[PDB]
Design a binder for these strands. Structure first.
Lengths: 71, 98, 48, 159, 49, 22, 341, 49, 63, 146
RNA sequence: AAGGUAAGUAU
């Protein structure tokens, strides 16, 4: 149970790259409605990853148990 | 690769069939071979590092087997941890010998 | 004029008072709801 | 792509046969590259170490094509053809990235380095928008590979 | 509708007007970090803890 | 030198808004 | 610390207290004092220095910005021709000012601001204010004062220069600034506080703590290219030691099924290549990708572990069609190169 | 500290106004083998940035 | 369960050992299975058999 | 004093200049290639080509009727023994790195690490410790061998 | 005029 909770709540590699911003390399604004939003090293040169980071499926969003009962 | 080859066959009756690589052994025979090889692997760490094998805790024997080793040339970083801040003195060559 | 292709009129633009008041109120609610908030978030809201 | 294949089927040694695939066209995989600059440098290194590796040139130029720099990709493919002339995959990729008229020239040059390749010949049929032009190229193709039914079947459409 | 504005020129001229990286970073503790250059550097927006 | 953002009502009115844009 | 707060900026105060914890200012001063002692202890019979002593000073001497004393005391063998006081950067020296038997060396640490990070003017002003002072205590009328700006990592010196001292002081200060344990601690603490890094990202990485989690049911491939290019070297008593190339082997071990895929490479491949080190990496990566394409999707790996850091980027390039495969470096050296033995 | 882009540690503020940078803020200095050398940015005899 | 817990509290019974299966072997006995892997495997399989031994013994005695 | 006005370091301007240089270099190579790529009756007569092909069909029947090592090794001469032989493998280096392809032996490297560690444990020009470390016996191969 | 007091043990 603790391992599953830590996997669900622990930092993911893509979410690890999200909070890393390259120093000195100004990036064009991505999201119009929110200028604060930025991908960080995600999809930008300098991240050190040649291949694209994959989605951690342990962080998938799914309905609660009681919401399954209603369905 | 010299004593280990001797350990890998524990008895003169143990042979390697041409089908595979390692010799065919009984389960407890493999236990004994593994403990002998663990002693062999600890032997060079005891020799080349001049440390007693008994001084190795069960946590660091695992690191020795796997192949992780640590070194620390910069012990002066001990700085990270009547006052003893100027009390340290300097010994010159003259003091060393004059 | 699309037919004569000539200068016929002249349009003067101006920001409506309601739009200015809306922007001022938006900046006010950015500022007043910024007690325990990072400087970066406040500047991001102002920039947006 | 990979030009090496290994089919998998009381002996410790199992030498499995080495096979070569005639052509390999992996999907473009748009956006799979995270560091475009690092990937570009590494692909440059591949081109330098193995200039006679057609997959190296194919991946290096297609990386410029996914990036949007569609002009450097043409130069990379042209250099690859200059260094990998016997690979029909590089010539087929050249006929795709290059603009129309020059693409025709590319095919007109591929025949110089590889005349038996029926695949480029039929490719020229797509490249030439004139039926009379198709008559010249396809009938010229049969002067080098007349045993190909897949190419001779276009004679009826060629009239 | 697309992105109907661009701030590339604005940010470029903002860095140029502040004196570039050298002029901007004299105001900061960057020279106290003793990084040889600003090229291979990245921030971490949120700490590990 | 104060750093205060001064209003440009009548200031920098000579230039158009198309300047320094591409 | 010697940091002067211009107003109560509580966040800055907390940050500077954390950065200079465990008495870092005193430790930096002591380390620089020791470094000057050693650099002057080596060249004592060439600079005509009879002896060098570390003056017994207060533990809070590093903190005194109003006054100062001497940290290093040089006693001359015969005498020293004191030159006119000048900055460390002054190339021209008028070595005809006075004479002396004792030389004092003072090291002052400061935390400069943007408007006042000029270390040369600071050193000149401090030397003039301390030499011509009845509060500062010095053991001789001549000496030099070295000023360090930690906030900007600048260094300078002002005062008298006996012959052979200025170049030695310059080189020693350059070496100390470039490398020093207490200075390195300061840089690391400032980096951690500012939280910017010199390109050391954290990625999946086979340590000894996640070794247990390796043993799952998923397919794992240990790829080794250590024995790709290899030669045998043998020394002969009658002649000279000689080398002979031998065929290489790529290891594609699979710990689950035990399948050891051995790619045997002839020595003819390294015929006319100038750069064999990366040719081996690219050949091995090509073989790994080809083997992945050979196996079916059910037996295809989804976690490739590499025993050499050099074969991380080549695999990422050659696995560009398989994004669902994680390539993990191993910081612990597995003994997969000994299977050829 | 306001108009420096967020990548360099600044707040990345966008200015719809008239802000002058004092020339005293456009000066920096660097240390090399020959000693310390000081740099400005506004070579042209113009107003403050 | 409370009977067992209070027996263990007062030292009547030895404290329960972790239940280790093959998939569990690298989590409970991970550090000792690198030094003597086969001894650890034998111990784990002996524990598994003893757990199976008690179940079959109870089934046979009840039958 | 008078400060020297240095070149303003604008990372965005540098990026734009690099992109423009790449764009202008790409155009030059395109024109250079077009200087070469652009320098390469029966095409309408089906009967003529058919006759030529029939001639070709009988035409085919009528025709039927080691010195390469000058690299370096990161070891000492005294390290090896005359009575033994050992394998030398390439040292790990990044592909993007341009360093020379030095050569090592894993057992000798392990021994060197062990002796370095024991020396460091026993431990516990100007300014030797702050210079050599912050800022590996080896010998290359002369023709056939050193 | 301020919004600029480190706190803690010991006599």
């Amino acid at each position: 149970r603790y391992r599953k909770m830590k996997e669900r709540l622990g930092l993911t590699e893509i979410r690890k790259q999200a909070n890393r911003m390259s120093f000195g390399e100004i990036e064009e604004d991505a999201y119009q409605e929110d200028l604060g939003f930025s991908l960080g090293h995600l999809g930008k040169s300098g991240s050190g990853r040649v291949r694209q980071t994959q989605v951690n499926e342990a962080t998938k969003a799914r309905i609660s148990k009681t919401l399954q009962r209603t369905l | 690769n010299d004593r280990a080859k001797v350990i890998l066959k524990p008895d003169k009756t143990t042979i390697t069939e041409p089908h595979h690589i390692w010799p065919t052994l009984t389960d407890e025979e493999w236990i004994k071979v593994e403990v002998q090889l663990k002693d062999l692997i600890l032997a060079d760490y005891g020799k080349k590092n001049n440390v007693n094998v008994a001084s190795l805790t069960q946590s660091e024997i695992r690191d020795i087997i796997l192949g992780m080793e640590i070194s620390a040339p910069s012990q002066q970083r001990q700085q990270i941890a009547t006052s003893n801040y100027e009390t340290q003195t300097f010994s010159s060559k003259t003091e060393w010998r004059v | 004029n699309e037919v004569t292709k000539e200068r016929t009129a002249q349009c003067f633009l101006r920001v409506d008072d309601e739009s200015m008041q809306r922007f001022h109120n938006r900046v006010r609610q950015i500022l007043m709801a910024s007690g325990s908030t990072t400087f970066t978030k406040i500047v991001n809201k102002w920039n947006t | 792509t990979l030009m090496d294949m290994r089919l998998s089927q009381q002996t410790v040694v199992d030498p499995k046969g080495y096979l070569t695939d005639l052509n390999s066209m992996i999907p473009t995989h748009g956006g799979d590259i995270n560091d475009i600059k690092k990937a570009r440098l590494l692909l440059k290194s591949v081109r330098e170490t193995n200039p006679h590796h057609p997959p190296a040139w194919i991946a290096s130029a297609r990386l410029e094509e996914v990036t949007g720099k569609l002009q450097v990709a043409r130069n990379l493919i042209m250099k690859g053809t200059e260094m990998c002339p016997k690979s029909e995959d590089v010539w087929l990729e050249a006929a795709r990235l290059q603009p129309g008229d020059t693409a025709k020239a590319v095919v007109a040059q591929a025949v110089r380095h590889l005349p038996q390749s029926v695949r480029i010949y039929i490719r020229a049929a797509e490249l030439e928008t004139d039926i009379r032009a198709k008559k010249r190229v396809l009938r010229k193709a049969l002067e080098h590979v007349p045993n190909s039914v897949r190419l001779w079947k276009a004679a009826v459409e060629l009239e | 509708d697309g992105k109907l504005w661009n701030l590339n020129n604005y940010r470029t001229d903002m860095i140029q007007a502040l004196g570039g990286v050298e002029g901007i970073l004299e105001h900061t503790l960057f020279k106290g970090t003793y990084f040889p250059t600003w090229e291979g550097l990245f921030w971490e927006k949120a700490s590990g803890f | 030198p104060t750093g205060e953002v001064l209003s440009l009502v009548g200031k920098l009115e000579g230039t158009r808004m198309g300047d320094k844009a591409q | 610390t010697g940091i002067f707060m211009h107003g109560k900026i509580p966040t800055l105060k907390i940050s500077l207290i954390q950065i200079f914890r465990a008495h870092l200012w005193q430790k930096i001063h002591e380390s620089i004092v020791m470094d000057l002692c050693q650099v002057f202890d080596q060249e004592l019979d060439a600079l005509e220095i009879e002896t060098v002593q570390k003056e017994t000073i207060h533990p809070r001497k590093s903190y005194k910005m109003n006054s100062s004393c001497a940290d290093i005391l040089l006693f001359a063998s015969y005498k020293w021709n004191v030159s006119r006081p000048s900055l460390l950067a002054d190339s021209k020296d008028v070595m005809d000012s006075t004479t002396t038997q004792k030389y004092w060396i003072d090291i002052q640490l400061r935390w400069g601001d943007y408007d006042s990070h000029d270390i040369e003017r600071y050193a000149r002003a401090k030397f003039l204010d301390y030499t011509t002072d009845n509060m500062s205590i010095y053991p001789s009328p001549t000496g030099v004062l070295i000023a360090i700006d930690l906030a900007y990592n600048l260094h300078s010196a002002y005062g008298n220069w006996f012959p052979g001292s200025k170049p030695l002081i310059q080189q020693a200060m350059a070496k100390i600034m470039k490398a020093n344990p207490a200075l390195y601690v300061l840089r690391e603490r400032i980096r951690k506080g500012l939280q910017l890094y010199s390109s050391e990202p954290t990625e999946p990485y086979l340590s000894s703590q996640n070794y247990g989690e390796l043993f799952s049911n998923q397919i794992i491939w240990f790829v080794d290219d250590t024995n790709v290019y290899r030669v045998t070297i043998h020394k002969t008593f009658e002649g000279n030691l000689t080398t002979k190339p031998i065929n290489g082997a790529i290891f594609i071990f699979n710990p689950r099924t035990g399948q050891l895929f051995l790619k045997i490479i002839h020595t003819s491949v390294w015929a006319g290549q100038k750069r064999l080190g990366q040719l081996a990496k690219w050949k091995t990566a090509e073989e790994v990708a080809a083997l992945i394409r050979s196996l079916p999707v059910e037996e295809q790996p989804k976690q490739i572990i590499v025993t050499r850091k050099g074969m991380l980027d080549p695999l990422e390039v050659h696995l560009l069609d398989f994004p669902n495969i994680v390539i993990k470096g191993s910081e612990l050296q597995l003994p997969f190169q000994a299977c050829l033995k | 500290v306001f108009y420096t882009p967020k990548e360099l540690g600044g707040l990345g503020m966008l200015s719809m106004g008239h802000v002058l940078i004092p020339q005293s803020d456009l000066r920096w200095s660097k240390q090399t083998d020959v000693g310390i050398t000081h740099f400005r940015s506004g070579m042209s005899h113009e107003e403050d940035q | 369960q409370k009977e067992l817990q209070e027996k263990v509290r007062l030292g009547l019974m030895p404290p329960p050992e972790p239940k280790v299966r093959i998939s569990n072997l690298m989590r409970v006995l991970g550090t000792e299975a690198v030094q003597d892997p086969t001894k650890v495997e034998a111990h784990v399989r002996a524990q598994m058999a003893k757990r199976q031994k008690a179940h079959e013994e109870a089934n046979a005695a009840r039958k | 004093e008078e400060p020297v006005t240095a070149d303003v370091i604008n990372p965005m301007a540098l990026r734009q200049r690099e992109e423009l240089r790449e764009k202008l270099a790409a155009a030059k190579e395109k024109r250079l290639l077009n200087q070469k790529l652009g320098k390469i009756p029966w095409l309408d007569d089906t009967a003529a080509w058919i006759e030529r092909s029939r001639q070709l069909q009988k035409e085919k029947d009528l025709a039927e009727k080691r010195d390469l090592q000058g690299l370096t090794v990161e070891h000492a001469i005294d390290s090896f023994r005359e009575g033994e032989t050992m394998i030398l493998t390439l040292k790990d280096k990044g592909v993007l790195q341009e360093e020379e392809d030095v050569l090592v032996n894993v057992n000798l490297v392990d021994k060197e690490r062990a002796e370095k560690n024991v020396e460091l444990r026993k431990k516990k020009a100007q300014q030797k410790p702050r210079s050599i470390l912050s800022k590996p016996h080896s010998f290359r191969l002369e023709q056939g061998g050193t």
